[PDB]
Amino acid sequence: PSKNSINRPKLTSNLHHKVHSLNKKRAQRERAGLLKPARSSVNSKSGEIKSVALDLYFQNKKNSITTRTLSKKRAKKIERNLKYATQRKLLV
Amino acid sequence: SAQKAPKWYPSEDVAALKKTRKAARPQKLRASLVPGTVLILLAGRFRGKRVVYLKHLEDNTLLISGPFKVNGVPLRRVNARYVIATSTKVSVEGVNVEKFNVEYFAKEIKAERVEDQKVVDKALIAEIKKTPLLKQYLSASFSLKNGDKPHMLKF
């Protein structure tokens, strides 16, 4: 506590406020959908390849401010490699 | 080559285990756990309830009954380390519990359970009614009060 007010709790009140604030912010982020889903969720990528480029390519094929962009060089390479995979799937 | 093949490999034959000198001898229960004793359940769904101990089973579990007419606890298994044995005992010579065992309780309402419950509960009620306040005692639940000391409490 403070020397100017010894009967008033200070650190405990600050800690209580901080805990409540962090819990509220975590709930808000979860509701906004910025957290990963459960491991067994259908849209979970656990155990699979994680790629910004492939996510962007498939989102654009499916049809705010972000720093995730996909270059045309990588997009053309993804198109070429997908045609390779499709030819293999047809031949098998 | 990404890696040179090692010269020596471990054998793929699984070894056998050695012969074990650990025989299963029967459990020796606590001296205070006698058939007919009233027990306090310390854990589970029926925690804090007072039941009647009937039989020691082959899986080291105790068969108990409420009886179901008194406090609604059916014929169940409990672990002996999760009950507290009291000083109160009812007469158990009129109860036939030869049918109940591990196979009886295996889960892989049946109404065989219900009829057996009634058959045991009849003789249990007949003996319970002899001691005054015993039915009310079995219907009431156990809990710790303020200042109770389990290391000094007598049961």
Binding site: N23, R26, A27 | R30, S32, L42, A43, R47, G48, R81, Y82, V83, I84, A85, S141, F142, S143, L144, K145, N146, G147, K149, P150, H151, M152, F155
Partner: protein, 106 residues
């Protein structure tokens, strides 16, 4: 009735320590109503739970548990030593724990 408690209240005092190093693997526990080591011998081997709350739900509950057990008495005044599966977080020095009555010898 008005009370449903089946445990004894306890306080997490501190870790096992000398004057200038602590051992987080062992907690010191003060059980309510226990004033001598001979009294505390009743509680050796009993299960202990530290029961706490969190905002994020996990498997259908906001209540979380750290489990442990009483191992031996400590000192002359009735304090015991305890070991938990995961060590207690040291923010709980002075927090409450529950000592259950199982496994039972009565």
């Amino acid at each position: 009735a008005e009370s449903h408690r089946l445990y004894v209240k306890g306080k997490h005092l501190s870790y096992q320590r000398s004057k200038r190093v602590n051992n987080p693997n062992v907690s010191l526990i003060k059980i309510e109503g226990v004033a001598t080591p001979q009294d505390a011998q009743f509680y050796l081997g009993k299960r202990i739970a530290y029961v706490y709350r969190a905002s994020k739900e996990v498997r259908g509950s906001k209540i979380r548990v750290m489990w442990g057990k009483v191992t031996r008495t400590h000192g002359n005044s009735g304090v015991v030593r305890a070991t938990f599966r995961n060590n207690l977080p040291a923010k709980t020095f002075g927090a409450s724990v529950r000592i259950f009555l199982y496994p039972s010898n009565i």
